[PDB]
Amino acid sequence: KVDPKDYMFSGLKDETVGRLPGTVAGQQFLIQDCENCNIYIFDHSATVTIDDCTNCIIFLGPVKGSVFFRNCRDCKCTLACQQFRVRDCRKLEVFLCCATQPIIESSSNIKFGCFQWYYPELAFQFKDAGLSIFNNTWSNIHDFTPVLNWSLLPEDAVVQDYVPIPTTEELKAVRVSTEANRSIVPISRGQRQKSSDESCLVVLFAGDYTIANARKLIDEMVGKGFFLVQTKEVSMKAEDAQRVFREKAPDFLPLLNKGPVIALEFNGDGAVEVCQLIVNEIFNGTKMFVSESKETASGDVDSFYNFADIQ
Numbered sequence: 001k002v003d004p005k006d007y008m009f010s011g012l013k014d015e016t017v018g019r020l021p022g023t024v025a026g027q028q029f030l031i032q033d034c035e036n037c038n039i040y041i042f043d044h045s046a047t048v049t050i051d052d053c054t055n056c057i058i059f060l061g062p063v064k065g066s067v068f069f070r071n072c073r074d075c076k077c078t079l080a081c082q083q084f085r086v087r088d089c090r091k092l093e094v095f096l097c098c099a100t101q102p103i104i105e106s107s108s109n110i111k112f113g114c115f116q117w118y119y120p121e122l123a124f125q126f127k128d129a130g131l132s133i134f135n136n137t138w139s140n141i142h143d144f145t146p147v148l149n150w151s152l153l154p155e156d157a158v159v160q161d162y163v164p165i166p167t168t169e170e171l172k173a174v175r176v177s178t179e180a181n182r183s184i185v186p187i188s189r190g191q192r193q194k195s196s197d198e199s200c201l202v203v204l205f206a207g208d209y210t211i212a213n214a215r216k217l218i219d220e221m222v223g224k225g226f227f228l229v230q231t232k233e234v235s236m237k238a239e240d241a242q243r244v245f246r247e248k249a250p251d252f253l254p255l256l257n258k259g260p261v262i263a264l265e266f267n268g269d270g271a272v273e274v275c276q277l278i279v280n281e282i283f284n285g286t287k288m289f290v291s292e293s294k295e296t297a298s299g300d301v302d303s304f305y306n307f308a309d310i311q
Contacts, residue, residue, distance in 0.1 A: 002027060012037050018171045019043050021121040026064065026128060040166050042174045044125040057163055062129035076162040078117050080131055080185065086110055093153060093162055096138040097185045099131060105144040113153035114138050114190070118182040119174050126184065134214070134233040134262055139190030152192060186218050189227050189267070199229070200271040201300035202279070203244070203289040205252065206259030213283060214262045220278045226268040232308050236261045240307040244300055245289055255287055263304050272297055
């Protein structure tokens, strides 16, 4: 029996509360008028609203639609969602995975870091919510009321300083890691400042092992000291392929119909040559686009996001 009473936390002060996997299953959640609380929703949701909360610590599992904060202050959060909205809030710190551009309004001191979190059930919770781990624009904030009102968290932030793992016997049954290498969402730098002006685009096409290949390639590049700037998972038409891949397009055209492509953007000096080498050594006989040169890589990237931001 599903009833709205079981899908809310309201009017609490100085408590830890939460939801175990399977316990929400895509339903809708409300957190309202809580002060000094720690709240852990270890499941996928349709939408979550957080109203009038103060000094709270919040984990939200994959949200299929929108997360809305209204009238909250001094909360620290880790969450994944399709859309993110902050209205009339102050001093929020968020480790975010968001499929669209995060939006703030009438708010100040809003700080953003990349989602960094793992537990065994998380990957299927993302699939059930229809959220790709590769669609994350956590740092590209739009402020509806400029007067600057947001910034990025420090890059070396230890998640456990902001959003501690739960202690309680109930919530312990969930096997959490907040280590960067365990994170279900790949750590991307987004709009963080760059020390290299060399980029490299990789596009992987739909297939048995495409996601695992993308993870392996990120691991290889990042272990060599290259930066993962951003990723994407989108359907690609012949037109889009022609603009991005240029003369290499015809080799890849037969692969587009099978399903969404995965784009990876890397950053660092020698990124293009290094990436091509890793792709040759480790994925012989798997078709993969890699930027041809440093000169052309930035246009690869811009052409990709151009079509990908539309669809």
